[PDB]
Write an enzyme that holds these catalytic residues in place. Sequence first.
Site, PDB file in Angstrom:
ATOM      1  N   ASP A  62      94.513  65.938 121.364  1.00  0.00           N
ATOM      2  CA  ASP A  62      93.707  65.636 120.173  1.00  0.00           C
ATOM      3  C   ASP A  62      93.777  66.781 119.173  1.00  0.00           C
ATOM      4  O   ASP A  62      93.832  66.549 117.971  1.00  0.00           O
ATOM      5  CB  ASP A  62      92.222  65.407 120.501  1.00  0.00           C
ATOM      6  CG  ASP A  62      91.956  64.071 121.140  1.00  0.00           C
ATOM      7  OD1 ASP A  62      92.446  63.052 120.612  1.00  0.00           O
ATOM      8  OD2 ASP A  62      91.231  64.035 122.159  1.00  0.00           O
ATOM      9  N   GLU A  93      90.248  62.795 115.015  1.00  0.00           N
ATOM     10  CA  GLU A  93      90.921  63.449 116.138  1.00  0.00           C
ATOM     11  C   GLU A  93      90.130  64.743 116.416  1.00  0.00           C
ATOM     12  O   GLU A  93      90.007  65.178 117.565  1.00  0.00           O
ATOM     13  CB  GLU A  93      92.383  63.777 115.803  1.00  0.00           C
ATOM     14  CG  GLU A  93      93.271  62.571 115.438  1.00  0.00           C
ATOM     15  CD  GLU A  93      93.382  61.523 116.537  1.00  0.00           C
ATOM     16  OE1 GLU A  93      92.828  61.718 117.636  1.00  0.00           O
ATOM     17  OE2 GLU A  93      94.036  60.486 116.314  1.00  0.00           O
ATOM     18  N   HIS A  96      87.164  63.681 118.365  1.00  0.00           N
ATOM     19  CA  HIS A  96      87.580  63.388 119.737  1.00  0.00           C
ATOM     20  C   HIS A  96      87.711  64.685 120.529  1.00  0.00           C
ATOM     21  O   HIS A  96      87.186  64.811 121.637  1.00  0.00           O
ATOM     22  CB  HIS A  96      88.926  62.652 119.752  1.00  0.00           C
ATOM     23  CG  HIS A  96      88.882  61.310 119.098  1.00  0.00           C
ATOM     24  ND1 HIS A  96      89.993  60.508 118.968  1.00  0.00           N
ATOM     25  CD2 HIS A  96      87.857  60.634 118.525  1.00  0.00           C
ATOM     26  CE1 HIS A  96      89.658  59.394 118.340  1.00  0.00           C
ATOM     27  NE2 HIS A  96      88.368  59.447 118.061  1.00  0.00           N
ATOM     28  N   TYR A 100      85.035  66.544 124.109  1.00  0.00           N
ATOM     29  CA  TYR A 100      85.244  67.061 125.449  1.00  0.00           C
ATOM     30  C   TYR A 100      84.419  68.320 125.690  1.00  0.00           C
ATOM     31  O   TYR A 100      83.911  68.533 126.799  1.00  0.00           O
ATOM     32  CB  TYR A 100      86.726  67.309 125.696  1.00  0.00           C
ATOM     33  CG  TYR A 100      87.514  66.027 125.644  1.00  0.00           C
ATOM     34  CD1 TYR A 100      87.382  65.074 126.650  1.00  0.00           C
ATOM     35  CD2 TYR A 100      88.351  65.738 124.568  1.00  0.00           C
ATOM     36  CE1 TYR A 100      88.063  63.862 126.586  1.00  0.00           C
ATOM     37  CE2 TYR A 100      89.038  64.524 124.498  1.00  0.00           C
ATOM     38  CZ  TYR A 100      88.885  63.601 125.510  1.00  0.00           C
ATOM     39  OH  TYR A 100      89.549  62.404 125.455  1.00  0.00           O
ATOM     40  N   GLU A 153      99.287  58.288 120.665  1.00  0.00           N
ATOM     41  CA  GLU A 153      98.088  57.467 120.519  1.00  0.00           C
ATOM     42  C   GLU A 153      97.960  56.381 121.599  1.00  0.00           C
ATOM     43  O   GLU A 153      96.894  56.209 122.196  1.00  0.00           O
ATOM     44  CB  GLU A 153      98.074  56.803 119.135  1.00  0.00           C
ATOM     45  CG  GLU A 153      97.989  57.777 117.945  1.00  0.00           C
ATOM     46  CD  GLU A 153      96.592  58.331 117.690  1.00  0.00           C
ATOM     47  OE1 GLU A 153      95.688  58.179 118.547  1.00  0.00           O
ATOM     48  OE2 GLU A 153      96.395  58.938 116.617  1.00  0.00           O
TER      49      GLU A 153
HETATM   50 FE    FE Z   1      94.320  58.959 117.422  1.00  0.00          FE
HETATM   51 FE    FE Z   2      92.165  61.103 119.516  1.00  0.00          FE
END
Ligand code: FE
Ligand code: FE
Lengths: 283, 281
Positions: A62, A93, A96, A100, A153
Site C-alpha cells: 500500500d 492507499e 489503507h 494496519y 490491486e
Molecule cells: Fe488500490
Molecule cells: Fe490499498
Amino acid sequence: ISAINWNKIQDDKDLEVWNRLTSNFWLPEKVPLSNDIPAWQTLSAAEQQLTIRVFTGLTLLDTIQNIAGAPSLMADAITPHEEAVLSNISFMEAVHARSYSSIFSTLCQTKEVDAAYAWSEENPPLQRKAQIILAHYVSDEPLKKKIASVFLESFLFYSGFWLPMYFSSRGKLTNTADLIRLIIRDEAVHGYYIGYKYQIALQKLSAIEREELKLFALDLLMELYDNEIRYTEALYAETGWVNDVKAFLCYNANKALMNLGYEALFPPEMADVNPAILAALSP
Amino acid sequence: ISAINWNKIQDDKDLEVWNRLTSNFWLPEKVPLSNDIPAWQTLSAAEQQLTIRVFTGLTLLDTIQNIAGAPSLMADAITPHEEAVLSNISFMEAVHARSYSSIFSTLCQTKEVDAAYAWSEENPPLQRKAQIILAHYVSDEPLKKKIASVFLESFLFYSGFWLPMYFSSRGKLTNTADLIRLIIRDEAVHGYYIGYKYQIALQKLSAIEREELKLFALDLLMELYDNEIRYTEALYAETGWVNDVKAFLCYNANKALMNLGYEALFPPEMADVNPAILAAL
Ligand SMILES: [Fe+3]
Ligand SMILES: [Fe+3]
Ligand SMILES: [Fe+3]
Ligand SMILES: [Fe+3]
C-alpha cells in the site's frame, strides 16, 4: 492546464468511479477494532506472528501504491477527471496503509511489531515483488505500468487478505476482517478502473503491439505468481493452510486477468476456494 | 521503500495534520446547494457573471494544486507521514475544484458556464499567476515550491473567496457560503502545514541562503500581488467593490507570510477588511 469541468464528462465511467470511491470513504478509527482484543488472545504465538508479518507485507504494498504506483499513473491519464480519481486512489492507499498501524496499535505489542517490520525489510519474496512492481512504475511504459498496478490491486494482496477472512470464518478478528473488507471494497474498484483504462489504451494500438502486451502480461503474471507461491509457502509453513491460500491466489489471478480484459488462465481445479472463505469475503 | 509505521511518528505535527484533514473530509453533494436557487435569481446579470468567473478562476488553481502542486511537494517530504498527508491534500484539492462544477450545476446554464471557462482560457492576469506558480512547481527548487504553494493556499484564493462571503453577510447564497467555508477550513491548514515544513527546511540552510529565500518570497509575493490587482480591478470592475477586495487580499498576503515565519508586509491601514466579511469567515 485548464480548469476541470465536471459537467462535461468525457467518459461516464470516470464519474461513476469518482462517486463510488468518494462515497466509500472511511477511516480505521471508524472500525471498533478494540472488540477483537479477546479474539487476538485466543490466537497462538505462531498465528500472531503470521498475522503481523502478513499485515506488514500488505502495508509495504500500500505504501508503494500510495507513493509510486497511483501517482505514476497520473501522467498517463486520458481525461482530466481520471487524474482526479487517481488522486483519490493515491490518498486511499495511504488510508489503507495507515489502517494496519491502527490494528497493530490496538491488538499488538511494540516489540513483536518492530520485529515484523524488520522481517519485511529482509524477506526475499516480499522485496522481490516490491522490486518488480517498482521497476515498472519508474519505467516509461504506461501500459506495463497499468498491468503491474492491476496485478498489485487484484492479485498481490490476496495472499494476505486470506488470513483475516479465515479467522473471521471461525469468529476471530471479525472487526479486523470488516476493516479488510473496506480495503478490498476499494482495491476491487481500483483494479477494475485501472484495468478499464488499460483496455481503452489497447484499442489505440496495432494488433502486433496488443499481442506483445498480452504476452508480457502473462509472463509478468507467471513471474509474480511463482514468487507469490514462495512467499506463501514460507509464511504459512506448518499452518496446513498453504494449499488453501494457493487456490485463493489462482482465484484472484483470474480476476486480475479479467480486469485487464483477458480470459481466466487458471482452471477450476486450481482455483477452488473453500466456500467458507468466499462467504467471509462477502457475507 | 519501507512499509510506513504510524506508531513511530517522526514529527507529531504530521499526525496532527493527518487527523485534522481526514476528520474534516467532505463532499459538495453533502451541501444543500439547491436551497440557494431562489436567492440566486435575485442577483443581476453582472453579479452572476462575476460569481461564475470568480469560481472558474478558483477552479483552475485547485486543479493546478491537485495535478502539479501537492504532487510536486511529495518528492520533498522529510518524513513518510508527510507523504501520506500530501496525498490527502492533493485529493481534497480535487474535491474543492469539483465543488465548483457542483455549484454551476445547481445554479447556472451550460451557456453561462461555458462562457466563464472560455474567459478563463484568455484572461491575462489569471493565466499569468497560473503560469508563475506552475513555473516553480516544475522547477528543482524545493523551498521555492513551498513558498509558491503557501502563496497559492493563503493568498491567491481569497481574491475570490471574498465574494461568497459578501453575499453570505447579505443573506444571499448562504449554503454556497457554507461550502466555501469547508474549502477554507482545508486551505487554511494546507498553508499552515506547508509553511511549517518550509520553516523546518530553512533552519538547515546557511544564513546567507535564508536571507536570499526571504527576499525571494517578498519578490514573488509582490509579483503575484500586482498581478492579482490587475485581476481584481478588472473582474470586479463594474462593481465598486474592488476597494474591499484590495483590503482583503492584503489581509491574506500577511497571513501567507506568517505561515512562512515572516512579519506582515502591508500595514493594518491597508488590511482593514469589512468586519462583516471577516464574520462570514
Ligand atoms: Fe488500490
Ligand atoms: Fe490499498
Ligand atoms: Fe483547494
Ligand atoms: Fe489547498
